[PDB]
Design a protein around this ligand. Structure first.
Ligand SMILES: N=C(N)c1cc(-c2ccccc2)c(CCCN)s1
Ligand SMILES: N=C(N)c1cc(-c2ccccc2)c(CCCN)s1
Lengths: 236, 10, 236, 10
């Protein structure tokens, strides 16, 4: 890799600079280089990895949705033939997005997940695995879409099982996992009732545990709880 | 669109 | 070039799709491919070329300013030594920015300017030449900075001479050129009085010609006039 | 920072 010659600490430092400069492709390349040093990642470093790739894939997803919409309009009754260009360009963006998802999944498989023993690291990485399979599912058609959906589900479910046994109901990693699994149910798996039930139960169990928290932890947990509530308002 | 988690969690 | 196999019309179409998707690096690559077909560009196509590269270099300039500021703070009295990483990463972004500017300048020199005979195309391209030398000047230090500044000045001056002879004072290309030359004077050439004088004279001469314009042209001209006024408010 | 021209001009 092009980052093989740079010190691990320098890659981390530069990822933080790239974040400040809103250079998320650079940030992701630096964090990929850091992962490939082979050492486990601290909490802060896991968060840098996630921020970098979420921002990269976020731009790709937004672009894909714009293009896919134009393409669907182009395939309506009464629309003019404009050639293969819309499809080609949507496919170009789609392929780049799938490449980023495959890169992230490859880092998780080689070897972040297998070395992650603490609940906070293991749940974080399994949630990431579910998320990037979910992003693949958003663009999937044809004969592997069911398997991609099942891969997302399986990762989220393993993360949920650990989180419920090992973390309090207000833990922000647990909350963000449940939030994203509920989105999977609603948006990917055609299971809106499951999504609503999960969001409700997650919110209520967190509410009942807020009394145990410091002011700063209360702010972290309630921020994610509000996202659960926002989705419930959208979905009901 | 549904809201998903922020990238940074503690 | 990687776009050599794609039709000119398809490149233009995809540049417009890339704009809609906010994929400005793609947009620029498509428009570079279109220029390299060797045909002159229409007004709409010149605007697509400029939008694409302005957005690309705009992100680079914003990132460079963030990094350069961090670097200057790191070189204050009492700041801790943090190694070569800030400088290295600022240099990486700077080199990428210079590469984009050199690419644009290369397209203008090979062969957009020499084939541009109408005032509207020639002034547009010479203004672009001044702009991209100005962006180079923003990051220049050492022994060629004076020559880069003079290259910007020379391009802007040739464009100004044509625009004053061949275009009315409200023409939006003429106005945007004068606006950017005034910014050059203020921000690059250490000539704030020249900047203020140019902005004032440009604004007043446009004001006196607004009566000749349709409603739609009036909106185009007054939009740029307001930028001249905004700068005058900042500078005085 | 000073304002410069928008990229698209007619
Ligand atoms: N540079 C970034 N984006 C972040 C860094 C960290 C972090 C900093 C120290 C220790 C552990 C994590 C975040 C925690 C998440 C907040 N909700 S975010
Ligand atoms: N796709 C874009 N960004 C633009 C396209 C055009 C244009 C469209 C038809 C004919 C000439 C120019 C612009 C003019 C500039 C407005 N102030 S902007």
């Amino acid at each position: 890799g092009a980052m093989g010659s740079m010190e691990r600490a320098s890659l981390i430092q530069k990822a933080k600079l790239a974040e400040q400069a809103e250079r998320y492709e650079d940030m992701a390349a630096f964090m990929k280089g850091a992962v490939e040093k082979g050492e486990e990642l601290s909490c802060e470093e896991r968060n840098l990895l996630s921020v970098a790739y979420k921002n990269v894939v976020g731009g790709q997803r937004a672009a894909w949705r714009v293009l896919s919409s134009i393409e669907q309009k182009s395939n309506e009754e009464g629309s003019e033939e404009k050639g293969p260009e819309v499809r080609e360009y949507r496919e170009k963006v789609e392929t780049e997005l799938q490449g980023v998802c495959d890169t992230v999944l490859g880092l998780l498989d080689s070897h972040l997940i297998k070395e992650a023993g603490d609940a906070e690291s293991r749940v974080f990485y399994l949630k990431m695995k579910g998320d990037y399979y979910r992003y693949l599912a958003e663009v999937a058609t044809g004969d592997d879409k069911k398997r991609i959906i099942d891969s997302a589900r399986s990762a989220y479910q393993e993360a949920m099982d650990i989180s419920k046994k090992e973390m309090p109901p207000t833990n922000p990693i647990r909350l963000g996992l449940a939030l994203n699994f509920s989105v999977f149910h609603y948006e990917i798996a055609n299971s809106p009732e499951e999504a609503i039930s999960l969001a409700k139960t997650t919110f209520d169990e967190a509410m009942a545990d807020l009394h145990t928290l410091s002011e700063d932890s209360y702010k972290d947990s309630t921020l994610i709880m509000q996202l659960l509530r926002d989705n419930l308002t959208l979905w009901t | 669109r549904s809201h998903s988690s922020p990238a940074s969690l503690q």
